[PDB]
Amino acid sequence: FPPQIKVAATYMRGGTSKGVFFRLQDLPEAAQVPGPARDALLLRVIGSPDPYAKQIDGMGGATSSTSKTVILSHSSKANHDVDYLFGQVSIDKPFVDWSGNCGNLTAAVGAFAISNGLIDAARIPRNGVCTVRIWQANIGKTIIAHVPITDGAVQETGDFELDGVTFPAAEVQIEFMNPAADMFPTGNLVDVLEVPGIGRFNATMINAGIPTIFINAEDLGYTGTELQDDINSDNAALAKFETIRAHGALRMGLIKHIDEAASRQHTPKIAFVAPPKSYASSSGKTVAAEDVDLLVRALSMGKLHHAMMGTAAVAIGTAAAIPGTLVNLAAGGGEKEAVRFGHPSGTLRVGAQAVQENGEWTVIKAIMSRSARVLMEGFVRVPKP
C-alpha cells in the first residue's frame, strides 16, 4: 500500500458550479493523453464510482454541478490562448463524459489560464481586462472570456451578482462564438415528438451550446415556476422526461436506436419553457413576471437542474433569437436580440443577435456574464495508480 500520489490542482467555482482544474503538464505522464489512465485518475480525485452517491471519499459533491474536472493546456490553435477540456464525472459509474462543454466552468477557465502560465504574458495587462481566447476542445468552438486584471493578477473579488452564486465576485463577460453546430438538425423550428402510448409533444430541437430539446411546460402539466422539490422526487415525471429526451435524441440524429439514450445521459439536454409568471426562487427571492421574458427549467442527468446549465443558457439565447422556436414563442414571438429567463435560482440575461444572410438566420455569438474564484489550491491526492 504505497503512499498517495500528489497532483497539483486548483478547486474553483466557475459560475454556478465547482470543479477540479489541472494544467495538462501537472498530470501524471500516463494521464497526459485521453484514455483509461486519465479517466481513472479523475474518477479517484472526484470520489467515483460511488455506490453511496455521496462522494465523501473525493473532491466531488455528489451532484452534476460538483462532480466535475477540467484540463487546460497551451493552445496550438491559431488565434487561441488556451485549450479547454471538460470532463463530467459520473457519480455512480466508472465513466468520465467528454462529449460536452461546461458553460459555467468556462468562467473559471480564463482566470485559471492567466494565473497558471497558460497565456502569452504579452496578452496580460498590468491592469484592465485580459481577453482570453479559449479553444473549447470537447466541441470544437471558440469562447472568449474577458477577465479583469488588477496588479498583474486576476481580479477575483467584486460586487457582481449571479443568481445561484451565494456571494458576489468580479464580473467575467463570456462570448460563445458561432454557437450553432457546424442549428436545427431536423430542419424545422418546431417538431412534434411522437412518443407512442405516452403522448405527443411540440418541441424545438437546437444544436447551440449543447444539443437541447425544448418542450412547453403546459404540455407536461407544468407552469414553468417549478423548483427542484416539485419534480425530483416524482419518478413518473422523471421517467417521462427521459423517454421524451430519448425520442428527441433519435429525431435529432444523435442516436440511431432508442436504447442508446440510457448510456448517453449528457446529451441532448431537455428543458421546458413558459411565458413569464411570478415565483419564489430557491433562495426565497420573488422573481416577478416583469423581471423576465420567459421561464426555462432544464434537466441535468435526469433531475431538474438547480439553476441553468451554461450551455443551456447559450441554447436559450440562440433559440430566442430565431422567430418561431418554442423558446422565442414563450418570450412573446418576434425578433429578439436578448432574453432574460427565470430558472429555479433566479434570472439570467443572455444576448444573441441573429442576422439574416441569404434569407437565413445566423448567430455570431451568444453573450452572458458569470464570475469565478479559487476555493482551494495545492495538491489533490489519490492512491497510487
Next chain:
Amino acid sequence: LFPPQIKVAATYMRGGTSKGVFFRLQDLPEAAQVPGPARDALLLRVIGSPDPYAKQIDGMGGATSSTSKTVILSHSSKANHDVDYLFGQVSIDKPFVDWSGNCGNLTAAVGAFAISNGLIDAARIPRNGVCTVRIWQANIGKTIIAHVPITDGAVQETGDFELDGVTFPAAEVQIEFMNPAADCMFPTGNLVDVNATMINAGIPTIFINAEDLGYTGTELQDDINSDKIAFVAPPKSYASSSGKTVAAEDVDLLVRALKLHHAMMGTAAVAIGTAAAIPGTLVNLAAGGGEKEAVRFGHPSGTLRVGAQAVQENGEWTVIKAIMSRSARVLMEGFVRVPKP
C-alpha cells in the same frame, strides 16, 4: 471528412459449435481496454449490430446467437490462473452487449488462443503433449480448465475428433468446468418447483418436461422458430438436422434449449450433466432416475456426452466438476476494421 477505419488485431475462431471474434485485451483501442460504453460500441460495430435488417451483413456477425459473439482475453494476475476470459454476447437487434454469462462452446477456443498469443507462461507449455490452461471465467467468477494438444510447440488444431454440430473433425479439446454450482445449485431450495427444475450450474437454467409445453423432445428448429429455458424428454429416435438418425438407444435423454438453439449451448450442457447427477431433478427423471455420473443427451444436431459426478454427504449433493470434449480452430487471423470511434 470521414476518417479511415481503424484496425484492431483479432482472431476469428470456431469454438465448439459457435464462432466468435477474439481479442487480446492489449490489442483493443485504449478506450475499450476497460468495461463501458466505448468497449460495447466497438464490439457492436465489429459484429454489425444493432441491425434492423437482422442479417449482420455489415460486420463479422452471422445473424444468430451462435455467431454474434466477442471474447476478450488477457494474462491473469489471479493466483492459480493463466488467462482471464471475458465473454460478450452481442445483441443482433439492440445496441447491447450482454456480459452476464459464459460461453461454454467458445471456452474451447479460449485455451488455444491463450497459448497461441502469449497469454500463458511458455514454461507451462510442453513441446509435444497437452497444455493444461487454467481459465478464470470473469463473467461468472469460475475456474475452467482446458487441455489443449500441442505439437512442435504450437497448438494442434487439426484432428479426427468429431462433435455433433461441427461440420469437420478437429483435435479434441477436453474441458473441465470446476465447481459449476453457483456460490447455490438450486436457488429455490427444491429439486422441482411449481413443474420446473431451476439450477444454477454452468448458466442459470430452467428445465421443463417437453410433454407439458406441448412438445416431444425430438423437435428441430423449423418446428418452433417460425411460431436459459430448456425442455427434456426420455430417449426417442429422430433424424437430426444433418439427416443422421439419432437412435433412442444412443441417448439417456433428449434436451432442446432456447430461438430454439441449433445444437446445445455449452453452459446448458453443464446444467444438464449437473442436474442429471442429482436424483430427482426433471433432467435426472427424463434419464430414468437413479445415480448418474454422466449422460449423453440428444439435441437437434446430434448427441453430446457430459460427465458430472455428484457426491452426497449429510443430505446434500456437491459436484466437483462437469466435463466434456469439444474442438476449436482459427478461421481467420489479422485485423478487423470499424470506422473511427
